[PDB]
Amino acid sequence: SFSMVTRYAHSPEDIQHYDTSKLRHEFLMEKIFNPGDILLTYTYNDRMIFGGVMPTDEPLEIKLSTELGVDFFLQRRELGIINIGGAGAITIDGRKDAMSNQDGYYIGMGTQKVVFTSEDRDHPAKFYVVSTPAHKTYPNKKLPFATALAKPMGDQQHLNKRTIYKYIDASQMDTCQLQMGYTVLEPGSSWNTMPAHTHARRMETYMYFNFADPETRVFHFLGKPDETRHITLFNEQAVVNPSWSIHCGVGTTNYAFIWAMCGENQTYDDMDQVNE
Template sequence: MYMEIRYATNPRETKTYDTERLREEFLIEKLFVEGKLTLVYSHVDRYITGAAVPTSEPIKLQADKHDMGADYFLARREIGIINIGGKGTVTVDGTAYDLETRDCLYVGLGNQEVIFTSADAAKPARFYLNSTPAHKNYPTEKVAISGAEAQHLGSIETSNERTIYRFIHENGVKSCQLVMGMTLLKPGNMWNTMPCHTHNRRSEVYLYFDMADDAVVFHMMGEPTETRHLVVRNEQAVISPSWSIHSGVGSQNYTFIWGMAGENQVFADMDMVAMQDLK
């Protein structure tokens, strides 16, 4: 297991960063490593982003006692897991949950053993992880992509026809603060979350995937009047603080998982930015 530590930044300092520094602070370039558990601990809302790719051997979700100060990972945390690879299983304190690609599993505070396995080592599961601090236990619950709350938005005229799937949210799977879902853009559509917004009460992490090797997404970030961008490739993630916009445009359509942490779970709690105010 490897866990990287990222510290919080402020908008005044961030606007002075060059490309390399922006990528160091906000872009997670290498999450999915076969046979490994990879974790990134951000001081932005104490959010942990990670991935587990089990092949011939299971992978156990472990706590770094020095960095987390806990005997097991979910001692004071909850976690959302979405599989973006082949069929796999997550076993939680002895109970097995099979996840097909794009299925989600929520695991609550206090569960001591979480183990990841793949049905086929040649086509391993690719488990994407979002974890936030928790104050009480909510039941472990699986949601298949077919059972998620779906909302169709956008149009081909604005290049943003998409379907939003909500898994962990105030009217779905219950959690302490974690909100998690997935957005699929239809072929021929490249824009997401535009017009853009911020939400001062929540931070967010995006994982972009289902992208060709030669495809990129230009992830827009920064204050609305001091915008910046990151060039993002397949299976890379971006940490988005509460003060930053978070939208993107791709060289072709793509899929992304969004996860949020903060003081509320209201999906529509957004501070919208008028297009004429962007700079």
């Protein structure tokens, strides 16, 4: 009931002739949150590990030692966490801290044991986890949804009306590379990251969830800015966006997504704004 799959990096040239089924296998995590299970992807775009943890009966922990060539999961890595599901808790080295819906956590490198548990097994917590390599330990921090700063953005004419939530951000805190945020599109607005960009020096992974209706789908565009493809996403699915690719998506209704960013810098304005 634990799975971690490996995905290789590619050039723009390599994917040019991929069909939709090949694009989907290569860039799309089709199953993230499943009850009782840990589902993870390891991408060779900056060695990000991401997935979800949905504990029910037994408490769930990510135990990786020999698999990463290390003594314990976070020995050389750091970790972001956001709970998009029901009420639950994570205990960090024995200190149990409760996490409600949309509560975040940062866990710095060197932290040896993090255990994921849910309060009500029939409405469990869904922990979206993103781990990146780390050379420096920074203090663990809880990012409450309560104290999270909501910023409305976008207008109705451009169909981008949304609320942006800072979670793991170099302005509020210090991390090695990982950055994470939360974006809720208002009803009647489906476009995300519409003015698009390719930041060569970092990559992003988007995970789309909280779909308005079970019938909504999101079309995520990726690819070189002149050559764009799209992947159609159902609820609680994610797509990896390499450094050379634009990352944007359009919905049939409103939805929400978590983006995770990493690379060799945290500076937000290094991107090249994009004609496609």
